[PDB]
Write a protein that binds this ligand. Structure first.
Ligand code: DGD
Ligand code: CLA
Ligand code: CLA
Ligand code: CLA
Ligand code: CLA
Ligand code: CLA
Ligand code: LMG
Ligand code: LMG
Ligand code: BCR
Ligand code: BCR
Ligand code: STE
Ligand code: STE
Ligand code: FE2
Lengths: 115, 38, 37, 33, 36, 82, 34, 34, 65, 341, 30, 505, 32
């Protein structure tokens, strides 16, 4: 249904007629969206953790970035130095392109499976 | 008086102490041996 | 007596206005059904 | 439908009061610049 | 040092997992938990 | 980019590693096997065997219903099998 | 010259040893019959 | 009971065998600690 | 700054900003008190929880009479 | 240069796995929580607390094994090994549900240890502590669901049991008894998790599709150097694309990444609040206006009334087996059922 | 009255979309 | 300029205006207290503390005044139902007025401290800069806290110079304000022992006085001063928030489980009293005792006080409400008027049958009747075609002993089913649903609403603690990381000890 | 008293809307 409670009706009746919860493709969809939310927070917190000091405490740190500036606005080596110690060195990215490909791939692929 | 659960309480208390004291004992010893050079 | 040196201007840019009004309106849209019950 | 009559004022102030707050801060930001 | 080539370590290790896991799937159809 | 421990790749391709671990791994595997095949796991953990969930003509669950006599309850159910 | 025994060695074997033991126990379980 | 020694024997033998094979190099390590 | 009568009376209570005792001072004593208080809170919790049961301590409403 | 500073030195050595003072709390508790879950799922039954099998040893598979909650008759007992219930007997402790409290409490203290570890490492490296702050959300979820929730109910029995299927049963329970899907705090959580996943996918794809050509290879990964100062993708072209596709785009990289922290952290915090209410059966179960109308007007039907019939079926059909301590006996003739089914 | 309220909030959101897109603060390069 | 979420940081280095702000906040809180009390007084019906006590009426601050000894109105009524009494000035109305006056006085002092911010008291005499000696402030404030805590226990709660506190019997039947003597033995740590609350305040008050003396005279060690940033008032905010969410969890818990300070005549019963059939057991204990000493059924149940019967009813269970079901309990099931009597069901063969009670988990529950042994003997069937246990087939009847319907028997199946539907809720009451246009759906009590709010605020304040504690220990990088951080500090192996540049290899 | 229930919202908005208008104009005067 095109409705909020209708959506719930749909998913309840789906569970009785199919048991979507015990189906591995739904389990991968959960891993896709939970892991998607997790890595959203992780990436956001690691980049936000390693912003380069560009502002005073009386101003939003967001004003330390100017649309179109050529230089990066955080220190990825500091972020990697923090996250690789949080876990161990090789569970942390040092390549921003691989990192953002991973961000893209995990939730997309999990939601492909759940669809 | 000193009921069975109060006895158990003291057992749990001493066991915790043993675990923490043994742990810190071992950690101090290692740190004394394998110091950092400055 | 000197005026207070700790005073500061406050700001809210236009994008923050739009983001806040959206938050408020969507929250009201979400909770209104429960207020009317 | 037999809804809570106070739901209306509840909803109205819930929208109005924080919205006015933001507008006040926005407008006085523009007139600095 | 670097005596056993790593591709051989990883092939044998890999077949080792395939085997224990296959054993677990066989056990879903035999014995306890088989419905029989 | 190293903290001084020996690289893993160098360890698991080394001959000495495999001289120790071609023993230690099957040993640990067979130990776990025996833990189960001997029946010891059932006894340690209190897990029912397939013939000891119910008494022969019983279809009630031996459910613990008391907090402070719970232990004695489990023991009473078990005796209703022996 | 690398040391053999390290904090890392302990962490690795803290996980590895019971893992293989549990794997052995779970393997034996596939032959249990009711 | 006996089933415990049965279980624990492979573990003790395996730990014995790794000791035998590593002892020489583990002595080198302890000495280097001053 | 404005001086006032109450201000001059209270003055010495706000005159040792930044003064510290050297090194660890009473930190060892603090830790003793902390550990006793932890044990004390464990006891109180476990009494309420009925994990610690004591003679003459009936943790029930029926202890109002 | 006394023993405290010497031990500090040793805890904070750069090594493959960093230890720190936080490690003294984290590593024992994390490993015991984990070990208890693997031990219980491999060997331990739920027969005496639940009337369920729940271990590999018993015939269960990865999806159906669990460490199950203790029996309802234990109340909120800590269920300490040396406590008055198990009286130091490890076997009885297992059979009584002791591994559940063992895992939950050690897991709680492990979570604290992990967040202290985030603080500790960030301080040593000189970064801001926002990763620690973000982790407050999973803490709030854990404590609200595993601790606060069963503490408001009759016992730990009604907390989530630690298993795949057992969590599935938790979800369904909450639908039928609490009508949790109707709860706006859950709804905000849903938006936050789905919104986080969306942000994650859309940001990774934008970056990967606005890259600068910085090498000649068709594998664009190699043309990034972690010490380059230059942005590796074009914020400007990304902003144009999204403005023209969607109407609005990000223009501030700092705001973008903060927003990515904010959305899922806030969503999880919101859901935790709703679960706190459900600790007290303070549900968003009904709309009163709808019930008054439907009671009087048998031709009034909505997706809201249809879902409550589903809840009523869930409760009556699962309660006897899901709550065995209550001794519910529902004869066939009282079970609610539609036609034919 | 509840219907009027729901639809009023919805219409205010649509109006906000319009200002947020066509009357945004323009992004300006450096 | 400042973003909106940081406006109040202008007070961090301005002790006068910080005090003005704290005064204004205290004025607001005291003003709420007085306004809330006046609203409750304007809506409270005092005419029936048996079946319409305060907790059925959505009263929230009334029970807190009664708890500590305020029990009467200037209007001449008291909450225990005594009529024609004189409280003197400390009536509900006088307490409300006092808070309002207090509010107004705090507001004027706020204005003065805001204008006259630049007091020499706030300046460090060595450096000329605003400075607070927080270690000494703590010892002063702790000493004061200790004196107040002691006095409250030694004078108010004992009745030595004060009214005492609310105490009752175990079944919440006869409560009143009484002086309470301390309990000094181990039963003083029993939450249900009121003497322990007296002893706690006496002893902790003395400990507070002594610790406070310690903290005025002994400076903090340098190791601790630097570790906890004791020159940064935000560390105090961090630890104060922690202490506060700790306190909030405790008062949610004791409210929910019940203790000597959350008595059931003031906040209502707990859910655990329904779970454990606590009141039904006592009621049955009395009916069995009246029967052994030779009373008829009619006589033994007629001796059950209505107040006790009313506790044995699921509609007073605080775990039967909902988040958006607003207002007093009376708005749901109505204003209780009378106990109808105790319903006894029997089948056509004369066995007593027992309605299975609704558990708190269930919005709806079916109607099943059991014999003493728990064997199902009758129900209200859903599907009729294969019903075996209908009331019609089993000839179920209901008789009433005690209450309004005492001595009456009903046999027409629809009437009998009607009372069976009510018996799942416990004892059966007549309600006035018209006066408040009650909708018939259960609401939670003040015990429930208080627990909810305090558990939620506590959880949120845990975030505040993490936030401000982070800001305290990371003040130096709040605005970003060193732009001259070198990669050798964050790369592996360079330093033996992470972040310590003196441990270079 | 059986008063008109739209009276409450009518009075609240009669106060709020014009008051807010004036507050908006005054604050932006002070910051310029
Ligand atoms: C955020 C950061 C996270 C950091 C957390 C890190 C993890 C720390 C570990 C915390 C461990 C918590 C253990 C609490 C156990 C508990 O409560 O155990 C419960 C016991 C009370 O016991 C219960 O008591 C109930 C009511 O009993 C009473 O009522 C009955 C009915 O009449 C009888 O009269 C009976 O005799 C009488 O005692 C029932 O008997 C239950 O079966 C029994 O379990 O409380 C007690 O131990 C103590 C209760 C007072 C302390 C309150 C603190 C609890 C905090 C949760 C508060 C929120 C509560 C949820 C509300 C929503
Ligand atoms: C940092 C490590 C850590 C932490 C935080 C915990 C925490 C916990 N454990 Mg876990 N545990 C750990 C390590 C840890 N454990 C390790 C290493 C093991 C393996 C041995 C275990 C094995 C274990 C088991 C088997 C059980 C727990 C249990 C518990 C819980 C109760 C603890 C308790 O009551 O302690 C009480 C004790 C203290 C708090 C110590 C206080 C120290 C005092 C102040 C010193 C006293 C001085 C001394 C006695 C004087 C000497 C006098 C003498 C001369 C006579 C709690 C969640 C129980 C549980 O989970 O229940 C479900 C349980 O049954 N733990
Ligand atoms: C579109 C579908 C949808 C979505 C996106 C969500 C999303 C959510 N649901 Mg809802 N749910 C839905 C449908 C959905 N729900 C429906 C239809 C129902 C039926 C009523 C429910 C019933 C439901 C319940 C009953 C609950 C939720 C909860 C949640 C939240 C889970 C938060 C989380 O990550 O917990 C994951 C858990 C954590 C983050 C806790 C800490 C975890 C630590 C870090 C683990 C560390 C692991 C460690 C390393 C060891 C692992 C090793 C081992 C595995 C090998 C989240 C807001 C929960 C909630 O609201 O919580 C407050 C909750 O209890 N949902
Ligand atoms: C002359 C002072 C005075 C007096 C006699 C009263 C009296 C009263 N007030 Mg009022 N009140 C006052 C000032 C006063 N108030 C001020 C200044 C404010 C503004 C903050 C208020 C705000 C206020 C509110 C908001 C409410 C009251 C309420 C009440 C009533 C219940 C009191 C109660 O339960 O406290 C409960 C006691 C506590 C909360 C104290 C717990 C303190 C914690 C445990 C201490 C923290 C730890 C400590 C620092 C450590 C000490 C160390 C130890 C070792 C010693 C009672 C009639 C209630 C009422 O019925 O209103 C009509 C109510 O809801 N008052
Ligand atoms: C600790 C706080 C507290 C508690 C426990 C109570 C409890 C109670 N009050 Mg009192 N009251 C309080 C504070 C409190 N009050 C204050 C501060 C005021 C002044 C506003 C009042 C004014 C007041 C009046 C006027 C009345 C009561 C009444 C009552 C009773 C009914 C409450 C009810 O229906 O709630 C309903 C509660 C809810 C529907 C919950 C609302 C939760 C909101 C919607 C959540 C918001 C979510 C947020 C937007 C999400 C943001 C997330 C993201 C953007 C970051 C009950 C005993 C009533 C009564 O019976 O009196 C006799 C009554 O008429 N109270
Ligand atoms: C005693 C409690 C206390 C005190 C004194 C402070 C004080 C402060 N906080 Mg902390 N904080 C607290 C609790 C506290 N906080 C808690 C519980 C949380 C978790 C929710 C936080 C989370 C928090 C964050 C995340 C931040 C602060 C910041 C700040 C500073 C700026 C606040 C500001 O300008 O707000 C301005 C606020 C407004 C203009 C409007 C707020 C409107 C809110 C959403 C709703 C209205 C509440 C309502 C009126 C009544 C509350 C009822 C009940 C809570 C009593 C200031 C030092 C900021 C900071 O560090 O700056 C450097 C910052 O970023 N605080
Ligand atoms: C100015 C700012 C105020 C405007 C902001 C917007 C107002 C929002 C109002 C939200 C509440 C509206 C609910 C509907 C209530 C109403 O319509 O009925 C009005 C209800 C009272 O209920 C009325 O009572 C009457 C008899 O007195 C009759 O029974 C009426 O039928 C009944 O509706 O009002 C309340 O009880 C409100 C006070 C409750 C506050 C305490 C709750 C604490 C909950 C903890 C919350 C923490 C969550 C934090 C989240 C993070
Ligand atoms: C350095 C070393 C570090 C050590 C690593 C240790 C990490 C902890 C291990 C966690 C892994 C948990 C997997 C246990 C699976 C298991 O034992 O099944 C063991 C069971 C045993 O199989 C069951 O055996 C029973 C015996 O009576 C019956 O025969 C049952 O029918 C049969 O199903 O096998 C499975 O259920 C099926 C096999 C495939 C299962 C794959 C699940 C793993 C994939 C899920 C996603 C990964 C999970 C991790 C993310 C969460
Ligand atoms: C509880 C307890 C304890 C502890 C214990 C412990 C500590 C344990 C541990 C344990 C352990 C530690 C275990 C482990 C296990 C593991 C496992 C069993 C594994 C499995 C795995 C798997 C099966 C996997 C597979 C796979 C797949 C499927 C796919 C991919 C590949 C892979 C291979 C991964 C104590 C004594 C204190 C006492 C008290 C009680
Ligand atoms: C000046 C003066 C005076 C007067 C005074 C006055 C008159 C006062 C009053 C005061 C008051 C009269 C006050 C009040 C207050 C109030 C308040 C302060 C409120 C608050 C509220 C809130 C905060 C809420 C919130 C919420 C909501 C809204 C919703 C739900 C949720 C919550 C709960 C969160 C006198 C004569 C004495 C003397 C001289 C001077
Ligand atoms: C991975 C390889 C899986 C092994 C196949 C197991 C299938 C056994 C099914 C059966 O017993 O018929
Ligand atoms: C403060 C940290 C506490 C750390 C460890 C506490 C628990 C250590 C576990 C020790 C418990 C095992 C021995 C108790 C077994 C009970 C036997 C008995 O009751 O006689
Ligand atoms: Fe990014």
């Amino acid at each position: 249904p095109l409705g909020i409670s209708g959506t719930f009706n749909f998913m309840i009746v789906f569970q009785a007629e199919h048991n979507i919860l015990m189906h591995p493709f739904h389990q991968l969809g959960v891993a896709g969206v939970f892991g998607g939310a997790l890595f959203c927070a992780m990436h956001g917190s690691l980049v936000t953790s390693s912003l380069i000091r560009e502002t005073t405490e009386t101003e939003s740190a967001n004003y330390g970035y100017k649309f179109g500036q050529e230089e990066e606005t955080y220190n990825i080596v500091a972020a990697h130095g923090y996250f690789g110690r949080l876990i161990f060195q090789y569970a942390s990215f040092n390549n921003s392109r691989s990192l953002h490909f991973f961000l893209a791939a995990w939730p997309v692929v999990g939601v492909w499976f759940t669809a | 008086t000193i009921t069975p659960s109060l006895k158990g309480f003291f057992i749990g208390l001493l066991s915790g102490a043993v675990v923490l004291g043994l742990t810190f004992a071992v950690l101090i010893a290692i740190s004394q041996i394998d110091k950092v050079q400055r | 007596m000197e005026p207070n040196p700790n005073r500061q201007p406050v700001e809210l840019n236009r994008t923050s206005l739009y983001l806040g009004l959206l938050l408020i309106l969507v929250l009201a849209l979400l909770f209104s059904s429960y207020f009317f019950n | 439908m037999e809804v809570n009559q106070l739901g209306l004022i509840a909803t109205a102030l819930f929208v109005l009061v924080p919205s006015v707050f933001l507008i006040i801060l926005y407008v006085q930001t523009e007139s600095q610049q | 040092g670097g005596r056993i080539p790593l591709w051989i370590v990883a092939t044998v290790a890999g077949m080792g997992v395939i085997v224990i896991v296959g054993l677990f799937f066989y056990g879903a159809y035999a014995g306890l938990g088989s419905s029989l | 980019g190293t903290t001084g421990e020996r690289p893993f790749s160098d360890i698991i391709t080394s001959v000495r590693y495999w001289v120790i671990h071609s023993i230690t791994i099957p040993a640990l595997f067979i130990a776990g096997w025996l833990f189960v095949s001997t029946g010891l796991a059932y006894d340690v953990f209190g897990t029912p065997r397939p013939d000891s969930y119910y008494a022969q003509e019983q279809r009630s669950i031996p459910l613990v219903t008391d907090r402070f006599e719970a232990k004695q309850q489990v023991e009473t159910f078990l005796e209703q099998l022996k | 010259s690398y040391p053999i025994f390290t904090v890392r060695w302990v962490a690795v074997h803290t996980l590895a040893v019971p893992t293989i033991f549990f794997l052995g126990a779970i393997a034996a379980m596939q032959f249990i019959q009711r | 009971d006996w089933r415990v020694l049965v279980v624990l024997l492979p573990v003790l033998l395996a730990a014995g065998w790794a000791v035998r094979n590593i002892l020489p190099y583990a002595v080198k390590q302890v000495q280097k600690l001053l | 700054a404005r001086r006032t009568w109450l201000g001059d009376i209270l003055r010495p209570l706000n005159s040792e900003y930044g003064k510290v005792a050297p090194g660890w001072g009473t930190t060892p004593l603090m830790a003793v008190f902390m550990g006793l208080f932890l044990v004390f809170l464990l006891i109180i919790l476990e009494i309420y929880n009925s994990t610690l049961i004591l003679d003459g301590v009936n943790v029930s409403w029926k202890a109002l009479g | 240069r006394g023993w405290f500073d010497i031990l500090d030195d040793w805890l904070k050595r750069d090594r493959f796995v960093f230890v720190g003072w936080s490690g003294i709390l984290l590593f024992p508790c994390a490993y015991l929580a984990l070990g208890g879950w693997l031990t219980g799922t491999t060997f331990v039954t739920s027969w005496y607390t639940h009337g369920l099998a729940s271990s590999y040893l018993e015939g269960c598979n990865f999806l159906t094994v669990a460490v199950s909650t203790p029996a309802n008759s234990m109340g909120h007992s800590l269920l300490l090994l040396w406590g008055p219930e198990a009286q130091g007997d490890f076997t009885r402790w297992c059979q009584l549900g002791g591994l559940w409290t063992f895992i939950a409490l050690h897991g709680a203290f492990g979570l604290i240890g992990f967040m202290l570890r985030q603080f500790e490492i960030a301080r040593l490296v000189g970064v801001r502590p926002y990763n620690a702050i973000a982790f407050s959300a999973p803490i709030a979820v854990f404590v609200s669901v595993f601790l606060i929730y069963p503490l408001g109910q009759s016992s730990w029995f009604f907390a989530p049991s630690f298993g795949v299927a057992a969590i599935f049963r938790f979800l369904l329970f909450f639908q039928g008894f609490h009508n949790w899907t109707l709860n706006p705090f859950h709804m905000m959580g849903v938006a936050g998790v789905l919104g986080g996943a969306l942000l994650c996918a859309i940001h990774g794809a934008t970056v990967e599709n606005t890259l600068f050509q910085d090498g000649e290879g068709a594998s664009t990964f190699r043309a990034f150097n972690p010490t380059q100062a230059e942005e590796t993708y074009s914020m400007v072209t990304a902003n144009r694309f999204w403005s023209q596709i969607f109407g609005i785009a990000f223009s501030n990289k700092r705001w973008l990444h903060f927003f990515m922290l904010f959305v899922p952290v806030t969503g999880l915090w919101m859901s935790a609040i709703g679960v706190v209410g459900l600790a007290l059966n303070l549900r968003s179960y009904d709309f009163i206006s709808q019930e008054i109308r439907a009671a009087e007007d048998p031709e009034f039907e909505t997706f809201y009334t249809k879902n409550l019939l589903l809840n009523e079926g869930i409760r009556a059909w699962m309660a006897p087996q899901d709550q065995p301590h209550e001794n519910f006996v529902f004869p066939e003739e009282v079970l609610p059922r539609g036609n034919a089914l | 009255m509840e219907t009027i309220t729901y639809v009023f909030i919805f219409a205010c959101i649509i109006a906000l979309f319009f200002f947020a897109i066509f009357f945004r603060e323009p992004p300006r390069i450096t | 300029g400042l973003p909106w979420y940081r406006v109040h940081t202008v007070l961090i280095n301005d002790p006068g205006r910080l005090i003005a702000a704290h005064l204004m906040h205290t004025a607001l809180v005291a003003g709420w207290a007085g306004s809330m009390a006046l609203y409750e007084l304007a809506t409270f019906d005092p005419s029936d503390p048996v079946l319409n006590p305060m907790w059925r009426q959505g009263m929230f601050v009334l029970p807190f005044m009664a708890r500590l000894g305020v029990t009467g109105s200037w209007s001449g009524w008291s909450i225990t139902g005594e009529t024609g009494i004189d409280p003197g000035f400390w009536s509900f109305e006088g307490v409300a007025l006092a808070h309002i006056v207090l509010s107004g006085l705090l507001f004027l002092a706020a204005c003065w401290h805001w204008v006259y911010w630049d007091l020499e008291l706030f300046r460090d005499p060595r450096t000329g800069e605003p400075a607070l000696d927080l270690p000494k402030m703590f010892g002063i404030h702790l000493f004061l806290a200790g004196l107040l805590c002691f006095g409250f226990g030694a004078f108010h709660l004992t009745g030595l110079f004060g009214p005492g506190m609310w105490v009752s019997d175990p079944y919440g039947l006869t409560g009143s304000v009484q002086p309470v003597a301390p309990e000094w033995g181990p039963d003083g740590f029993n939450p249900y022992n009121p003497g322990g609350v007296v002893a706690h305040h006496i002893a902790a008050g003395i400990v507070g006085i002594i610790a406070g003396l310690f903290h005025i005279l002994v400076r903090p060690p340098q190791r601790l001063y630097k570790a906890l940033r004791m020159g940064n008032i935000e560390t105090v905010l961090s630890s104060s928030i922690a202490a506060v969410f700790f306190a909030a969890f405790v008062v949610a818990g004791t409210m929910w489980y019940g203790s000597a300070t959350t008595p059931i005549e003031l906040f209502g019963p707990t859910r655990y009293q329904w779970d454990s059939s606590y009141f039904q057991q006592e009621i049955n204990r009395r009916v069995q005792a009246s029967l052994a000493s030779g009373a008829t059924l009619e006589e033994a149940w007629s001796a059950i006080p209505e107040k006790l019967a009313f506790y044995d009813y699921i509609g007073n269970n605080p775990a039967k409400g909902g988040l958006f079901r607003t207002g007093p309990m009376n708005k749901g099931d109505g204003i209780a008027q009378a106990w109808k009597g105790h319903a006894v069901f029997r089948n056509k063969e004369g066995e007593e049958l027992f309605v299975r009670r609704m558990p708190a988990f269930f919005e709806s529950f079916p109607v099943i009747l059991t014999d003493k042994n728990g064997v199902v003997k009758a129900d209200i069937p859903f599907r009729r075609a294969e019903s075996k246990y209908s009331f019609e087939q089993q000839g179920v009847t209901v008789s009433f002993y005690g209450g309004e319907l005492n001595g009456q028997t009903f046999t027409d199946p629809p009437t009998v089913k009607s009372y069976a539907r009510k018996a799942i809720f416990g004892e059966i009451f007549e309600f006035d649903t018209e006066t408040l246009n009650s909708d018939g759906i259960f609401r939670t009590s003040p015990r429930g609403w208080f627990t909810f709010a305090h558990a939620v605020f506590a959880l949120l304040f845990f975030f505040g603690h993490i936030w401000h504690g982070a800001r305290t220990l990371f003040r130096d990088v709040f605005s970003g990381i060193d732009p001259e951080l070198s990669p050798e500090q964050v790369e592996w192996g360079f330093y033996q000890k992470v972040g310590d540049v003196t441990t270079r290899r």
